[PDB]
Amino acid sequence: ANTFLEEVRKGNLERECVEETCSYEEAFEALESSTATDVFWAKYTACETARTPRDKLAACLEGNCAEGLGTNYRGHVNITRSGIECQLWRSRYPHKPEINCTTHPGADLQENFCRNPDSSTMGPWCYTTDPTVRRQECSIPVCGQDQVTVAMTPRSEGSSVNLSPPLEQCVPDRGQQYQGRLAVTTHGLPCLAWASAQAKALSKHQDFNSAVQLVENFCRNPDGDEEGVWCYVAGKPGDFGYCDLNYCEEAVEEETGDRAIEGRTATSEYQTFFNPRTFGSGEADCGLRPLFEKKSLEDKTERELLESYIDGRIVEGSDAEIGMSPWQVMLFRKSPQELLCGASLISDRWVLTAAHCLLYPPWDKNFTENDLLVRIGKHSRTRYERNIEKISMLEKIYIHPRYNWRENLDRDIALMKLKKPVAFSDYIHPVCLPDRETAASLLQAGYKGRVTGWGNLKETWTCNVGKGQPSVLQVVNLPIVERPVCKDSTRIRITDNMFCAGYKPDEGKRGDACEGDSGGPFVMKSPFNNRWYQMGIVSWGEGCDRDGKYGFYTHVFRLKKWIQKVIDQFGEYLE
Ligand SMILES: *[C@@H]1O[C@H](CO)[C@@H](O[C@@H]2O[C@H](CO)[C@@H](O)[C@H](O)[C@@H]2O)[C@H](O)[C@H]1NC(C)=O
Ligand SMILES: *[C@@H]1O[C@H](CO)[C@@H](O)[C@H](O)[C@H]1NC(C)=O
Ligand SMILES: [Mg+2]
Ligand SMILES: [Mg+2]
Ligand SMILES: [Mg+2]
Ligand SMILES: [Mg+2]
Ligand SMILES: [Mg+2]
Ligand SMILES: [Mg+2]
């Protein structure tokens, strides 16, 4: 095609095993090729149920139809039978495919269509972008005949005569101002009674600014938590539960209601709000790096932190600076070894990463407490540094109620505890804490964000050829992205418990709007008080897989009181 000699051969061949029959050695005569020989075979025997006529045959090997089943089919359709888009033929989000990128070159499993290189027990399928379902078949005509192999299902969103119909109007103040009768939660669980047998005798040393009455057995929020209401449950002695419900669009960026200059004069001012014996340390002393904040030493990228400094360019992966986040933490598997996820640090005894990292069945995984291990304050991922870095075990799997992997990583969050605690050092030092009221005032002004890692985020999700992971950590700053802007980027609907965070992107590239460690850190530094206030965990983003999208990481500002409760509960399973 397109020329003389590559064309020339075409004619000879339209006639050989098409209308007549042919062979290996017959093919190997007029062919003049070694490997190309088998480009044929895939589609040929795929169309086993038609040797003659060429008329009926026509569509099969052209590759826009299903003969019998459709191993001839290489055709191009974005979607599957129902509606929610197919997955690519290499990226592993949401469900991991069993067929990874190296295995089948026969079908040439690239792009995002529907394939069947392997003997399906129903028909030609592709993986979905919905988590509820792993794979499904798709709807193509017969080869040389008009007949869809499978039916469609549309699925839709209505209003005042399709749904039921409902229309509420929202709950203000994030759970305080509510009096309701509900007793159903996320998994499908109940409440327990506030003045019966187990909702008074342990309400012992806690902040009860009690305006609302103690009524019966519903979900409430009298403390003043900024998430919402919750009530109690029971099992292998453990958790309570936030009752799942629709809320307002009360964002933290610019709350409406009634270039600037620099300041410093202060060394620690904060709200001592947490219980240092069972909870322990990390509350006052945090985010004041041993090698930087304390000496008043900067790093290369503090000078540049403003939104309007040099009016927008793109930045590359930099071989990063030593010990400048001594709160960095790894994650691995027992027998055998395996690099799993990224994380983040706060105290001598408490820990964090993003909740995807274990309880996600599509990769077959109830890896309970003891499948696991950690290494801390590291640098050269290829090496071990023994002294500077250290080793401690992890405790138990504390489930956050609102985490929904089946849905769409909505509240991608949980908690754990260190087994043996750890000491404060040059190489070892935690990061600091902004509440809602801190978080809000911060983000109106023009400043930047930061994430780091060994490209473990960049690693885990796709195949990604050539670009081998950096054994040293990677660093680079990032800008803010407005809420008026971010929406129309993607047509799939968006949440206010996550955020857009990436550069102004380009056409022909994968991009670095997606870096660091998965479950890794989304950190910052205060000009108020010189502390290091974090504002997210490094979770998945469209930018990783989907070209020309943004670096995407999780919110933090709401749940001040979730763990305020937990810290007294830690001690109750002891001895
Ligand atoms: C399949 O998904 C494609 C992504 O590779 C989409 O391609 C884009 O489509 C827009 C128009 O909607 C173009 O302007 C843009 O240049 C790009 O090609 C596309 O929506 C979709 N294709 C089909 C056939 O549905
Ligand atoms: C994992 O399996 C164990 C026993 O096989 C079970 O008791 C436990 O409930 C599971 N994990 C979680 C978090 O439910
Ligand atoms: Mg012919
Ligand atoms: Mg011969
Ligand atoms: Mg021959
Ligand atoms: Mg011949
Ligand atoms: Mg011949
Ligand atoms: Mg020839």
Residue numbers in the entry: 1 to 258, 266 to 582
Give the original sentences from the paper that presented this experimental model:
The conversion of prothrombin (proT) to thrombin by the prothrombinase complex, composed of the enzyme factor Xa (fXa), the cofactor Va (fVa), Ca2+ and phospholipids, provides a biologically relevant example. Prothrombin, or clotting factor II, is a modular protein composed of 579 amino acids organized into the Gla domain (residues 1–46), kringle-1 (residues 65–143), kringle-2 (residues 170–248), and the protease domain (residues 285–579) connected by three intervening linkers. Activation of prothrombin by prothrombinase involves cleavage at two distinct sites, Arg271 and Arg320, along two alternative pathways that generate the zymogen precursor prethrombin-2 and the active enzyme meizothrombin, respectively. The hypothesis becomes relevant in the context of the recent observation that prothrombin exists in equilibrium between “open” and “closed” conformations that differ ~50 Å in overall length and with the closed form being predominant in solution (80%).
In this study, we report the characterization of the prothrombin mutant proTS101C/A470C (proTCC) in which kringle-1 is linked to the protease domain by an engineered disulfide bond. X-ray crystallography and smFRET measurements prove that proTCC captures essential features of the closed form of prothrombin. Locking the conformational ensemble in the closed form with proTCC produced crystallization under several conditions in only four days, yet crystals diffracted poorly (to 6 Å) despite several rounds of optimization over 10+ months. Crystals with size ~0.40 × 0.40 × 0.01 mm3 were grown in about one week at 4 °C in 100 mM bicine, pH 8.5 and 16% PEG 3350 for the 6 Å resolution structure. Crystals showed anisotropic diffraction with 3.8 Å resolution in one direction and 6 Å resolution in another direction and 3.8 Å resolution in one direction and 4.5 Å resolution in another direction for the structures at 6.0 Å and 4.1 Å resolution, respectively. In both cases, the structure could be solved by molecular replacement using the structural model of the closed form generated from recent smFRET measurements in which Lnk2 (154–167) and Lnk3 (257–275) were deleted due to their uncertain position. Structures at 6.0 Å and 4.1 Å resolution are superimposable. In this structure, prothrombin folds into an “L-shaped” form in which kringle-1 and protease domains engage in extensive intramolecular interactions. The domain-domain binding interface is dominated by the insertion of the aromatic side chain of residue Tyr93 in kringle-1 in the active site of the protease domain. Due to the low resolution of the structures, the binding interface could not be rendered in atomic details.
